[PDB]
């Protein structure tokens, strides 16, 4: 059924599975019209389809032309997401197709189930995890390819860079979700943390900087402090008072 | 007017005939029901006084044969049987009528309730939902499962209602996923009406039969089927105007007849709120919406 903290290790087992996040599919800026009404202008979006074990990210770029002359766009966006995930599954060799697709928002369940009727053995599941994948567009190279797109396009990434050479998928996923949660809570400060040191660079073929193991521990500590710091700024809490156990519950 | 004689009433039992009911005491000199209106299906149903488990009964049409009831002490129920000897049957009925051992089907002349509940219900269609071809009448009880319930376990004792499933390849044209899921008109008009039922009369007959089994036997799968058939119409943007007006009449009399005290178990809140207030047909069921709001405002 639903995916939560009780069955968290199932994400890193050998059954091919994908997360689908539709947050960034339909993106708009809201603005005033000359007559003083309000209007939206769509901007390019993306479907964030991620393998938690391998890091493979299937980034389907949603070009604003797909909305032209359509109504009820927030509803359509869910069905367009489902259509594109179904098309991706059909494009994969059978031995690469997922056994489960986990949607980050429960409103995707019916659209995806209906589009996947031809795949009755692929389980479509919600999750009780609050995952920060909406912050994907805070990763500069992902944002860049989405905005520059002039047509629909699928771009493939490994969102873990080369981390799996050194760490498990469980640890890589924990490092990813902490980075994304920090970027979601305070983008400016998170990016400051990630690039403050000009001697650490992002390889051309990577998304994140080339940190050593020790630098990653420092970075991850700084990200947990940021999320803690913001948590305090939000609720007006003296974080200095907080014990280590108290900090553990808040970070996720 | 036709007659269903009883051989005897050896066990205390509440007996229903259509929407009427009466209590018979253990070994009371009861020998059947007379003055049954010709021209409609009927249902004669039972709930034992010492074991209200298993409401059960028989759908029949007196035009199709001479039927009577006899208690079976081995199987522990009142069974319907057909008498093939016409003069034996006439002679049995005449004797029981002369001794006034029969209850009279108690139809008020002004009262169209039973017609309005069975307008589209035909025996021949019942016998395809309830498969027991050696009898002209059809047994139904509280516990019988539907073909769909069994897919989700004795197939001979099943209610073979037409399977309706909104998330199925039958309901959803490849390439029309969003369209067909949000507007079920394809599924209603092409798959179900043109394809399976052939016309709206057969669809309404099955709908009415499902409601009656739900109401009279507390048959849960029948209730599921009744609601699915309502929801399939209400969730279609394109429905013939004559079907919508007829549906409003059908549901009105169903809601009117439902025991006030069974609404919690016989009415699905989600379906009714969706059908009356959110669906394409939210404004097409005036009579039904008005009786539902005055009789079951809590459900809504
Ligand atoms: C590198 O490829 C594999 O390890 C295939 S097994 C598997 N892949 N993805 C999952 N979620 S389980
Ligand atoms: C905040 O959520 C987490 O999962 C943080 S734990 C962690 N991040 N990075 C590591 N190498 S272990």
Swiss-Prot record, chain A:
Changing residue 21 to N does what? Reduced growth at 30 degrees Celsius. Strongly reduced growth at 16 degrees Celsius
Q: Where is the stretch described as RNase H homology domain?
A: 7-252
Q: Which domain of life is it from?
A: Eukaryota
Q: Can you say where in the cell this protein is located? A: Nucleus
> Result of mutating residue 105 to K?
Severely impaired growth. Reduced growth at 30 degrees Celsius. Strongly reduced growth at 16 degrees Celsius
The domain comment in this protein's record states: The MPN (JAB/Mov34) domain has structural similarity with deubiquitinating enzymes, but lacks the residues that would bind the catalytic metal ion.
Any additional notes? Present with 468 molecules/cell in log phase SD medium.
Complex and partners:
Component of the U4/U6-U5 tri-snRNP complex composed of the U4, U6 and U5 snRNAs and at least PRP3, PRP4, PRP6, PRP8, PRP18, PRP31, PRP38, SNU13, SNU23, SNU66, SNU114, SPP381, SMB1, SMD1, SMD2, SMD3, SMX2, SMX3, LSM2, LSM3, LSM4, LSM5, LSM6, LSM7, LSM8, BRR2 and DIB1.
Main function: Functions as a scaffold that mediates the ordered assembly of spliceosomal proteins and snRNAs. Required for association of BRR2 with the spliceosomal U5 snRNP, and the subsequent assembly of the U4/U6-U5 tri-snRNP complex. Functions as a scaffold that positions spliceosomal U2, U5 and U6 snRNAs at splice sites on pre-mRNA substrates, so that splicing can occur. Interacts with both the 5' and the 3' splice site, as well as the branch region. Has a role in branch site-3' splice site selection. Associates with the branch site-3' splice 3'-exon region. Also has a role in cell cycle.
The name this protein carries in UniProt is Pre-mRNA-splicing factor 8
Species name for this entry? Saccharomyces cerevisiae (strain ATCC 204508 / S288c) (Baker's yeast)
Q: Which residues of the full protein are shown?
A: 1836 to 2084 of 2413
From Swiss-Prot, chain B:
Query: Where do the record's region annotations for Leucine-zipper lie?
Result: 244-265
Question: Which superkingdom heads the taxonomic lineage of this protein's source?
Answer: Eukaryota
InterPro entries under this entry?
A: AAR2, AAR2_C, AAR2_C_sf, Aar2_N, AAR2_N_sf
Task: Report keywords, A-Z.
Answer: Cytoplasm, mRNA processing, mRNA splicing, Nucleus, Phosphoprotein
Q: Which one Pfam family would you cite for this protein?
A: AAR2_1st
Its GO biological process annotations read: spliceosomal snRNP assembly; spliceosomal tri-snRNP complex assembly
Q: Name one GO cellular component term.
A: U5 snRNP
Q: Where in the cell is it found?
A: Cytoplasm; Nucleus
Q: What is its main location?
A: cytoplasm
Question: Consequence of mutating residue 236 to A?
Answer: No effect on interaction with PRP8
- List Phosphothreonine occurrences by residue: 257
**Which CDD domains does the entry mention?**
Aar2_C (cd13778), Aar2_N (cd13777)
Residues carrying Phosphoserine: 236
Spell out the post-translational modification annotation for this entry: Phosphorylated on serine and tyrosine residues.
**What family does this belong to?**
Belongs to the AAR2 family.
What does this gene product do? Component of the U5 snRNP complex that is required for spliceosome assembly and for pre-mRNA splicing. Involved in splicing pre-mRNA of the A1 cistron and other genes that are important for cell growth.
Subunit-structure text = Heterodimer. Interacts with PRP8 (via RNase H homology domain and MPN domain), competing with BRR2 for the same binding site. Component of a U5 snRNP complex that contains at least the U5 snRNA, PRP8, SNU114, AAR2, SMB1, SMD1, SMD2, SMD3, SME1, SMX2 and SMX3, but is not a component of the U4/U6-U5 tri-snRNP complex.
Miscellaneous note, as given in the UniProt record, is:
Present with 7330 molecules/cell in log phase SD medium.
What is this protein's name?
Answer: A1 cistron-splicing factor AAR2
